[PDB]
XYZ file of C-alpha atoms in Angstrom:
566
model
C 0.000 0.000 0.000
C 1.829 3.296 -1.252
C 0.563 6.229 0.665
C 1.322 8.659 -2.656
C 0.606 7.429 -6.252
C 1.443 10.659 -8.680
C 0.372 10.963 -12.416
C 3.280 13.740 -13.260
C 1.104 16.481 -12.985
C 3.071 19.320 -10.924
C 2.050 20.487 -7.382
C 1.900 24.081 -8.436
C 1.640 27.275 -6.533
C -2.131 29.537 -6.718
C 0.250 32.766 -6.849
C 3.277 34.536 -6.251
C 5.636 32.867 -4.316
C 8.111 34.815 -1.716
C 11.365 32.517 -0.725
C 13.927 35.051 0.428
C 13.976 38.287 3.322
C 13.643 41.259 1.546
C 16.395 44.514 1.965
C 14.258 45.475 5.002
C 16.032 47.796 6.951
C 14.178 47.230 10.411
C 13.991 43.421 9.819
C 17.120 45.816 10.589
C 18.713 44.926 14.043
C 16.377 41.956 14.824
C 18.694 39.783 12.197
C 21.378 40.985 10.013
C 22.477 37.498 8.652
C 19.152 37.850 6.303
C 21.583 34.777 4.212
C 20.398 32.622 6.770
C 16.081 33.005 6.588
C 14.820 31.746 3.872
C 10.800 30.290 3.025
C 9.515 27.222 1.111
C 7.900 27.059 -1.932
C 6.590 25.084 -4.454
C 9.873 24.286 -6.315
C 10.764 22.202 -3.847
C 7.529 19.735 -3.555
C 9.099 17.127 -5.834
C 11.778 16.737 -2.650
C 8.623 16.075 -0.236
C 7.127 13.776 -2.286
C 10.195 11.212 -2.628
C 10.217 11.823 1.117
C 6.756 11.255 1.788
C 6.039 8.009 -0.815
C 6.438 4.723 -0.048
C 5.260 1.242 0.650
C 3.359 0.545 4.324
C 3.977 -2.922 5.834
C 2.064 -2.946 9.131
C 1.626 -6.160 11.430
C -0.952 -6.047 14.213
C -0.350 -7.917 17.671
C -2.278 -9.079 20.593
C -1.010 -5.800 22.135
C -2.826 -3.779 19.748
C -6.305 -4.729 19.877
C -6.239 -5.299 24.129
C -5.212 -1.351 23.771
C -7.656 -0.670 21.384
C -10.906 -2.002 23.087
C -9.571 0.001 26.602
C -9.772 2.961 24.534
C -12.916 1.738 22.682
C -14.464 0.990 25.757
C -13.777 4.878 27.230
C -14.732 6.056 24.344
C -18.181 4.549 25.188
C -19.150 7.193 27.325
C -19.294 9.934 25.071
C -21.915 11.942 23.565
C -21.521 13.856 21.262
C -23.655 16.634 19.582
C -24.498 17.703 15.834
C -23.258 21.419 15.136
C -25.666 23.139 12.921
C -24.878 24.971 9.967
C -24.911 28.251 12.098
C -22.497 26.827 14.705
C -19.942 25.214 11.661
C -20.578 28.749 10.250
C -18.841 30.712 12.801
C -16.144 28.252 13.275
C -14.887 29.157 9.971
C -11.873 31.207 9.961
C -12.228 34.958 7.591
C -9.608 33.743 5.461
C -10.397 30.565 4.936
C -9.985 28.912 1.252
C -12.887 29.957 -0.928
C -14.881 27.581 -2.904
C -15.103 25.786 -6.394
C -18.964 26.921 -6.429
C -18.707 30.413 -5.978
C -18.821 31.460 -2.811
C -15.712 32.514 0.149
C -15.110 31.876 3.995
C -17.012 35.543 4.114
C -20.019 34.495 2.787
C -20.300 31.084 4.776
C -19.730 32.917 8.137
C -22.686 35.656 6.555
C -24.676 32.899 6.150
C -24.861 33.425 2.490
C -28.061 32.229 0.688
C -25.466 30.397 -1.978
C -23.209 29.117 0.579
C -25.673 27.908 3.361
C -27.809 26.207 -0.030
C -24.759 24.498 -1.257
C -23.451 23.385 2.542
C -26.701 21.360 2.425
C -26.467 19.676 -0.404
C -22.933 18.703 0.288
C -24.237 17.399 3.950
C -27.311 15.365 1.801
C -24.953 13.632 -0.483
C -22.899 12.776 2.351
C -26.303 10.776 3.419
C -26.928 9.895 -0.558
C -23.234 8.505 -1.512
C -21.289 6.199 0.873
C -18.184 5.363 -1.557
C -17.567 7.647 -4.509
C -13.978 9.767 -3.634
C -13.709 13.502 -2.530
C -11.866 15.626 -4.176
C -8.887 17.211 -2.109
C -6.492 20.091 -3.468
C -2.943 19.725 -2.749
C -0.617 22.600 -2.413
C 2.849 23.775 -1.032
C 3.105 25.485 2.037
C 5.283 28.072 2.747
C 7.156 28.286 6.026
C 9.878 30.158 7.172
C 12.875 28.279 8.789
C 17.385 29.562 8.762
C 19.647 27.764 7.166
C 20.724 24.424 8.372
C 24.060 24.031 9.887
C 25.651 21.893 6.907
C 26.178 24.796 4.523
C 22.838 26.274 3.195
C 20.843 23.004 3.671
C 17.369 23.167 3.484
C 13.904 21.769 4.632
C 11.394 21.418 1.494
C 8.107 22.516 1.166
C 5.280 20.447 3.279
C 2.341 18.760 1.538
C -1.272 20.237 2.708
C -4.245 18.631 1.696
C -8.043 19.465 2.003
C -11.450 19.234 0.379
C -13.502 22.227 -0.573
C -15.340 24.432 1.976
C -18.375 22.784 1.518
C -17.170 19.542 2.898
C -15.053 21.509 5.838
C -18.181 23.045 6.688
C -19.741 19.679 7.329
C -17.030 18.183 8.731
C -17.570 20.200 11.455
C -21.358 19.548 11.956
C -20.563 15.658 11.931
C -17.173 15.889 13.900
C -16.703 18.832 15.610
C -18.030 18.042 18.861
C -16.268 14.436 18.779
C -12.914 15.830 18.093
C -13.543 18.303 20.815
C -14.422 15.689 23.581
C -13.221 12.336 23.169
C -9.619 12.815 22.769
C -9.857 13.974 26.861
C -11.989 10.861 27.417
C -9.855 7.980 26.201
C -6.838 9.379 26.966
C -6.976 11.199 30.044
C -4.487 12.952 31.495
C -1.813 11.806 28.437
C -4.285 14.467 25.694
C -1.337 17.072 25.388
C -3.798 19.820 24.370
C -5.853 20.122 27.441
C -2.489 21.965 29.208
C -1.753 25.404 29.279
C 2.467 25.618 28.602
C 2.181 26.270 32.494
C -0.404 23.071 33.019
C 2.269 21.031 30.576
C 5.219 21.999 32.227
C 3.777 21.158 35.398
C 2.309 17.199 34.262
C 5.822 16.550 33.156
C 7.544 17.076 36.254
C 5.135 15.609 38.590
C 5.402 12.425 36.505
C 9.415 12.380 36.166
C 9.676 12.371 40.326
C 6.549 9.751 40.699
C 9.484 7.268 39.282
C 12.082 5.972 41.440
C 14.479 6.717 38.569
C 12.845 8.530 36.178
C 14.167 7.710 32.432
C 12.146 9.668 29.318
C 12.615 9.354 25.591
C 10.704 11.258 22.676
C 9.600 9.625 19.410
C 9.494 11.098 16.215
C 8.434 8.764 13.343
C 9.415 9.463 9.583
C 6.855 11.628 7.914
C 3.800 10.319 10.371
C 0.435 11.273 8.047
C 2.127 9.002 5.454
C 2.405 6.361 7.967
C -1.175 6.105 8.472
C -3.040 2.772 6.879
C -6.049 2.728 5.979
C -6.465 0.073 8.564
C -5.532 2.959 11.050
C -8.066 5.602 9.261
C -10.939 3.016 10.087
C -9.907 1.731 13.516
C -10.470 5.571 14.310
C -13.474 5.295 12.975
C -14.720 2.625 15.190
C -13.706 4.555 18.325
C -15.421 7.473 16.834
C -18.483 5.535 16.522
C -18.678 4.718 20.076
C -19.646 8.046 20.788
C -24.143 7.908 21.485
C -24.216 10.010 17.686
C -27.208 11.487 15.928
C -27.962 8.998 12.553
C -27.252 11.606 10.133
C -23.990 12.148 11.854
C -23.507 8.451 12.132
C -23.714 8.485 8.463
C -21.887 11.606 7.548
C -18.654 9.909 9.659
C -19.440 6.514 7.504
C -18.994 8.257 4.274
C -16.548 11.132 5.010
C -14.490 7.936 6.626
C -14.565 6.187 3.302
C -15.150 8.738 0.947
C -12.418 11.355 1.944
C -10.063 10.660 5.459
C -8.871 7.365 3.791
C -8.108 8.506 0.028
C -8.744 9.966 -2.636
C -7.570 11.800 -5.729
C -5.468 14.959 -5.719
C -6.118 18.091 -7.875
C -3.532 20.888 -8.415
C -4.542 25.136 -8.096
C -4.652 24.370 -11.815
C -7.316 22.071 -11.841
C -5.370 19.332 -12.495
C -4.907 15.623 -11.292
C -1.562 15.156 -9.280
C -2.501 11.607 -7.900
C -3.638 9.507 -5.000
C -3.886 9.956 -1.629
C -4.202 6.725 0.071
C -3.294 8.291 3.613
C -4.051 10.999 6.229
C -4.382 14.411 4.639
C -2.985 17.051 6.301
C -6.185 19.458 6.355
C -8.866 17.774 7.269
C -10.922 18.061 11.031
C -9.839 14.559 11.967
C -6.310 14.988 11.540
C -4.959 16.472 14.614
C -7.328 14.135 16.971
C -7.351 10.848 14.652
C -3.047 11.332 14.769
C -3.098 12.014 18.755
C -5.293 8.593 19.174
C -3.452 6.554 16.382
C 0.454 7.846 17.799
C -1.501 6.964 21.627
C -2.459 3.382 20.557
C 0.662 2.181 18.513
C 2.743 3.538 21.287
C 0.777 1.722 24.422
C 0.744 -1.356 22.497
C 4.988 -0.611 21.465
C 5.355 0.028 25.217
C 4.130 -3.393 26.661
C 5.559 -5.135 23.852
C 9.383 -3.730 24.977
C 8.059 -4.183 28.303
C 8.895 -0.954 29.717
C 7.699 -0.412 33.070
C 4.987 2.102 34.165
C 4.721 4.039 30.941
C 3.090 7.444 31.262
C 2.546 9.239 27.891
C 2.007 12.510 26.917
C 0.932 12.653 23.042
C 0.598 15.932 20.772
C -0.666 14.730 17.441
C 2.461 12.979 16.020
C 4.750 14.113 19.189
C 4.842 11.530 21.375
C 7.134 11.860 24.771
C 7.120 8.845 27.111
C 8.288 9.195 30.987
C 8.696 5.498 32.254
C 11.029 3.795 34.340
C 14.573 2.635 34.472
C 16.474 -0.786 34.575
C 19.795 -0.025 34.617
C 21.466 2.011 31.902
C 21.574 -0.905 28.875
C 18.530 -1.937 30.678
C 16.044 0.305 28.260
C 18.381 1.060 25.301
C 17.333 -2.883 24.567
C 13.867 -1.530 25.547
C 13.841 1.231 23.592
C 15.178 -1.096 20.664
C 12.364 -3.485 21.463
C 9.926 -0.207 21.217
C 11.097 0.908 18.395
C 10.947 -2.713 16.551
C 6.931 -2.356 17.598
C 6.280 1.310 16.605
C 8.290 0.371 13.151
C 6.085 -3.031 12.597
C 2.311 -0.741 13.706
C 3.943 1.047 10.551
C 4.824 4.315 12.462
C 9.188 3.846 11.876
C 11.494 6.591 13.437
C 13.281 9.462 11.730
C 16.138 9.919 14.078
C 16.236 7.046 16.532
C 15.217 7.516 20.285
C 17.406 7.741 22.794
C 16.992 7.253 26.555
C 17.396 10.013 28.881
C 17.829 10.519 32.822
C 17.448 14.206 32.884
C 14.016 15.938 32.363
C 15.278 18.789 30.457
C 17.381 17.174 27.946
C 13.967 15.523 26.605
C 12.624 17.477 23.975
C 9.112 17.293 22.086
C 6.850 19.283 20.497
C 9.935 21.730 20.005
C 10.734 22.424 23.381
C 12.003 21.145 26.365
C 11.738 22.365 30.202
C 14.252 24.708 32.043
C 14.636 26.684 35.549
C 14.988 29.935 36.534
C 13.815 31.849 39.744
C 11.348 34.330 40.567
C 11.653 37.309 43.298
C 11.162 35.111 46.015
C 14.334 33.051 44.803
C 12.321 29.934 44.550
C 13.375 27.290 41.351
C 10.614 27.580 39.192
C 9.894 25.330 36.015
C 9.022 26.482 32.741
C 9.038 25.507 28.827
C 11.430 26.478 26.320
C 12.939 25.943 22.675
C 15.606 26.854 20.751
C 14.571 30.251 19.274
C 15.956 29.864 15.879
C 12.749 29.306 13.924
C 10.766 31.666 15.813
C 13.515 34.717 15.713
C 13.592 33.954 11.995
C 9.930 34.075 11.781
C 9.623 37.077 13.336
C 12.049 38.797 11.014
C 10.159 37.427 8.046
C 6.887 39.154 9.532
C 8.408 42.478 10.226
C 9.857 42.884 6.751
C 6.299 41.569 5.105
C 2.748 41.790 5.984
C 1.333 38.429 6.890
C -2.455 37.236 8.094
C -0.557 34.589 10.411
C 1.657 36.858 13.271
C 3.674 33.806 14.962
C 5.597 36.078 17.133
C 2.618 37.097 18.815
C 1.776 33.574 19.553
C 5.364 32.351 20.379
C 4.935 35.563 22.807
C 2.198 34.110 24.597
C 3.077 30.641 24.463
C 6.737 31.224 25.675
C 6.417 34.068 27.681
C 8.472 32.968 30.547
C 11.595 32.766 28.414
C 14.754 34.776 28.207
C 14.433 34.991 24.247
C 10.572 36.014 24.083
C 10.700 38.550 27.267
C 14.064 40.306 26.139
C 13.864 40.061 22.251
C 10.712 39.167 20.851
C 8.458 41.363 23.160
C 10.735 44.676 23.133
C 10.716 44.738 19.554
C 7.260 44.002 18.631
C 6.072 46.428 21.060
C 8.545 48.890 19.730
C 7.136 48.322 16.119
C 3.671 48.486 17.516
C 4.607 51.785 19.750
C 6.145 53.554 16.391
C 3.659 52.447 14.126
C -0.269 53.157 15.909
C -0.985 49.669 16.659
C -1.796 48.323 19.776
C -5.167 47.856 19.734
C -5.377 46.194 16.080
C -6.068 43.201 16.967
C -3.595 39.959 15.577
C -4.328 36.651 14.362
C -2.286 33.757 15.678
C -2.239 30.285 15.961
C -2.319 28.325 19.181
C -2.853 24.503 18.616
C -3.465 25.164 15.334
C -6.748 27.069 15.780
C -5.909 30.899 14.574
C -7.504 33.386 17.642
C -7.960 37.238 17.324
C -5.694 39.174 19.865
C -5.313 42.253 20.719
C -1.306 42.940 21.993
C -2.374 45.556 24.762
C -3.836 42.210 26.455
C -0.782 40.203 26.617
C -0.168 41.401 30.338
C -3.489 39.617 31.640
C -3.327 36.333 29.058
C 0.734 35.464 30.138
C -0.560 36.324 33.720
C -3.295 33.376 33.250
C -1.055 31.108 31.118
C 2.125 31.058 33.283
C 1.460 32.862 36.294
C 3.071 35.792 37.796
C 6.455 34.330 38.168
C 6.680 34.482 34.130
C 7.311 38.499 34.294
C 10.257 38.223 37.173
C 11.864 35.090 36.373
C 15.908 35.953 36.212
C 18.649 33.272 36.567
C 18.418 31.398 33.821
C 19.879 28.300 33.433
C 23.628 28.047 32.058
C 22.222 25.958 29.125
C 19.267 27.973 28.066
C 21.670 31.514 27.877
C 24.217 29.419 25.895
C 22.000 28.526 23.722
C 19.905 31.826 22.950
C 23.540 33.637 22.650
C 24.479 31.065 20.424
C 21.030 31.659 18.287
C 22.029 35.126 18.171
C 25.260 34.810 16.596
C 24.352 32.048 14.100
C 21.718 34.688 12.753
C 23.036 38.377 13.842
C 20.418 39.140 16.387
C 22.054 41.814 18.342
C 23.598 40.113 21.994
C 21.191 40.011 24.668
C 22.479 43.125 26.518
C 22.015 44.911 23.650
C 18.057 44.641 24.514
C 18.268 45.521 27.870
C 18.924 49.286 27.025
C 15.806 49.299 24.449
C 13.885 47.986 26.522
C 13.467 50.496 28.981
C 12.904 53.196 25.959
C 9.679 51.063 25.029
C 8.824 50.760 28.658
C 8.968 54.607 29.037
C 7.005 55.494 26.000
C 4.469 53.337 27.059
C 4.239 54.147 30.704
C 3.916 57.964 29.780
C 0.929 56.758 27.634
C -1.249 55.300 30.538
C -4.241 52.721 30.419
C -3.909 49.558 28.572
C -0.712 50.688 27.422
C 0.353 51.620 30.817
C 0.318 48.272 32.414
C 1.950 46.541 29.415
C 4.824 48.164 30.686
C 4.921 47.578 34.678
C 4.923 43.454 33.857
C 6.762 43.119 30.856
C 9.538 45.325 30.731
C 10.193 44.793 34.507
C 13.580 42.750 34.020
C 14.616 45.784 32.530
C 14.450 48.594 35.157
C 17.568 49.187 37.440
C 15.242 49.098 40.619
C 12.237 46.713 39.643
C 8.795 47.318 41.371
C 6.760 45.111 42.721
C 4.031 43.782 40.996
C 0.698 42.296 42.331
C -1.978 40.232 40.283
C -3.836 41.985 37.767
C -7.636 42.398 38.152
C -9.283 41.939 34.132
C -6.842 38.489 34.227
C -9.088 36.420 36.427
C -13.243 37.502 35.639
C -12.851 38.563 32.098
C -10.776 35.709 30.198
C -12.112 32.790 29.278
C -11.669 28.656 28.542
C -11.493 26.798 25.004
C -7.791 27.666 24.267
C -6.780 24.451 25.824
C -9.111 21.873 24.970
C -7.812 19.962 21.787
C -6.068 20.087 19.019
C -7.328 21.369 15.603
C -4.021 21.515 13.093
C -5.517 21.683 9.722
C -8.431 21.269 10.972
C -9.789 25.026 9.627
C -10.344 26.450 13.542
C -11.317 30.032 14.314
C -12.237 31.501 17.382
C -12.080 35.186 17.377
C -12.343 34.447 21.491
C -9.743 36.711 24.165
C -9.264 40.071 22.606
């Protein structure tokens, strides 16, 4: 079973495509190495697909199906709901990908006569047709990344996939609810996206000391949507269909299971056919919750099979961390051997194998990893980090162009606590925003892959709520972490860190001598930069004015839009 089969016809781009910094002059002194940033493009999607085609052997054990009825069986106690087409409506994000029959993500969230008429009909074939293929589009997207360290190497474009508008609209009546609830249910505590960076942070150290030596590895398998059998599209299913369902929705899930999440053919921007899909598509509803239960079950079932000994998992769509514990040094590289043998025959093989580790914060997934520092009191506090390479890139790209997606703004919030995001990426996007007029436009960013409106003048309250109050007077970093960000800043010519320090207190000043909403942006953030810090007590609007469904599941690709916070 290939995942990919391709006719010859080229993955081409819908416009003009951008692929180098331009001779921005306050992309300036965030990043002077602009050599370095670079973003993909269609010309290199023939690289992706050799990476992403091939055969998929997969072997099911005993293991496997005693791991799938446990999660079958808590999956038994859900109910889930039918949206309407007013509730899919709104969850459509403004610049969503318009439609082969005439109408746009504007009119569908209007509740256009054309697009609301057509939504129907593509919801009453979904009842009429159980079998015949939906068409997907596949394109190129374009991320940002810097330069790899082996001379101007390069990461190639990724693959997305997704039907039309129509069918994402409906997706959402049938699935919306499911993918928004059981995840939590079968998986409990080991659902990565019901944790705050703060709640994360705070599961993974609790579980390292529960073990009388702790050991944790990460996985990464090679390309994981291609991995995906058909076999693992439908054993989804079934769990789905545990849920107490609505007929119509019990129908809709049939067919959109066999018409559309397990293949189908793929159509260029040009209207032409590329190929097959005969795997998970990138852009679907399903794809972030069917990969967090498929990565959950082949890696329970890998677990007992290597025999590793009290397992707990924390799983992220493909990311996949394990915190277990140790026999004795060659003890668990066997195991992890033994693992790996398991993952690789449930057809999910590595990329880079695993490796066992004894110290929390050399385990890194989902990017990051965990670090100390200490907060005014002088107590060790935890908190998550990354290497800031991508994101200091990525903010360089979005100050030189204008961009929908604002990732600084979200690596802001979701990395708040750090050294990099409190002394680089926050002084200079508030400078930007200071100069310019801006901040009360609000931003779109992504968290979990659902794109939220924000408004920057409310970043005080949400990192208050999202990491506490030690993430605004956190100061001793760890030897490690400043290595590393200093390091960053060389390998791209991002001015050295006390460089910032003396900006810093410029945008603090023009922004305290402003007053309101402004004003208090500059009492928490800038703090670490003032030569006798105040002290600062819990902000009021935080608590009684924020509000839930920011950490409740994942929805990458999955066309998610709340315009929820500010």
């Amino acid at each position: 079973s290939m995942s990919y089969t391709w006719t010859g016809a080229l993955i081409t781009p819908c416009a003009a495509e951008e692929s180098k910094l331009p001779i921005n002059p306050l992309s300036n002194s965030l990043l002077r190495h602009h050599n370095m940033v670079y973003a993909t493009t269609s010309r290199s999607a023939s690289l992706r697909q050799k990476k992403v085609t091939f055969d998929r052997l997969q072997v099911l054990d005993d293991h496997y199906r005693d791991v799938l009825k446990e999660m079958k069986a808590k999956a038994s106690t859900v109910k889930a709901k039918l949206l309407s087409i007013e509730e899919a409506c709104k969850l459509t994000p403004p610049h969503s990908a318009k439609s082969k029959f005439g109408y746009g993500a504007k009119d569908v969230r209007n509740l256009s006569s054309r697009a609301v008429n057509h939504i129907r009909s593509v919801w009453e074939d979904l009842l009429e047709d159980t079998e015949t293929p939906i068409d997907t589009t596949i394109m190129a997207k374009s991320e940002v990344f810097c330069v790899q360290p082996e001379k101007g190497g390069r990461k190639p474009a990724r693959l997305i996939v997704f039907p039309d508008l129509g069918v994402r609209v409906c997706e959402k009546m049938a699935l919306y609810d499911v993918v928004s609830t059981l995840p939590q249910a079968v998986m409990g505590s080991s659902y990565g996206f019901q944790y705050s960076p703060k709640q994360r942070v705070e599961f993974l150290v609790n579980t390292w000391k529960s073990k009388k030596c702790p050991m944790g590895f990460s996985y990464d398998t090679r390309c994981f949507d291609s991995t995906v059998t058909e076999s693992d599209i439908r054993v989804e299913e079934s769990i789905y269909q545990c849920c107490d369902l609505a007929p119509e929705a019990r129908q809709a899930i049939r067919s959109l299971t066999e018409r559309l999440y397990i293949g189908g053919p793929l159509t260029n921007s040009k209207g032409q056919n590329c190929g097959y899909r005969r795997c998970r598509a990138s852009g679907v509803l399903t794809t972030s919750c069917g990969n967090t239960l498929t990565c959950y079950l082949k890696a329970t079932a890998a677990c007992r099979a290597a025999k590793l000994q009290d397992c707990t998992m924390l799983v992220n769509g493909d990311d996949l961390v394990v915190i277990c514990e140790s026999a004795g040094t060659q003890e668990d590289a066997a195991a992890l051997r033994a693992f790996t043998e398991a993952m690789t025959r449930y057809s999910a093989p590595p990329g880079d194998p695993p490796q066992p580790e004894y110290d929390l914060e050399l385990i890194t997934s989902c990017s990051s990893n965990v670090s100390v520092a200490h907060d005014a009191s002088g107590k060790r506090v935890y908190y998550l980090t990354r290497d800031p390479t991508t994101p200091l890139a990525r903010a360089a790209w979005e100050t030189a162009r204008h961009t929908p997606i604002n990732s600084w703004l979200g690596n802001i919030i979701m990395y708040a606590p750090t050294l990099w995001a409190r002394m680089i990426l926050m002084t200079h996007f508030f400078s930007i925003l200071l100069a310019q007029e801006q901040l009360e436009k609000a931003l779109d960013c992504q968290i979990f892959g659902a794109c939220y409106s924000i408004e920057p003048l409310d970043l005080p309250q949400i990192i208050e709520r999202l990491h506490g109050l030690s993430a605004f007077t956190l100061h001793s970093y760890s030897p490690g972490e400043i290595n590393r960000v200093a390091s960053c800043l060389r390998k791209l010519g991002v001015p050295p860190l006390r460089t910032w320090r003396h900006r810093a207190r410029s945008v603090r000043a023009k922004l305290l001598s402003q007053g309101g909403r402004a004003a208090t942006c500059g009492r928490y953030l800038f703090n670490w930069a003032v030569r006798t810090k105040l002290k600062l007590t819990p902000i009021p609007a935080a608590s009684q004015l924020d509000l839930s469904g920011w950490f409740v599941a994942g929805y990458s690709g999955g066309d998610i839009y709340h315009s929820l916070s500010r």
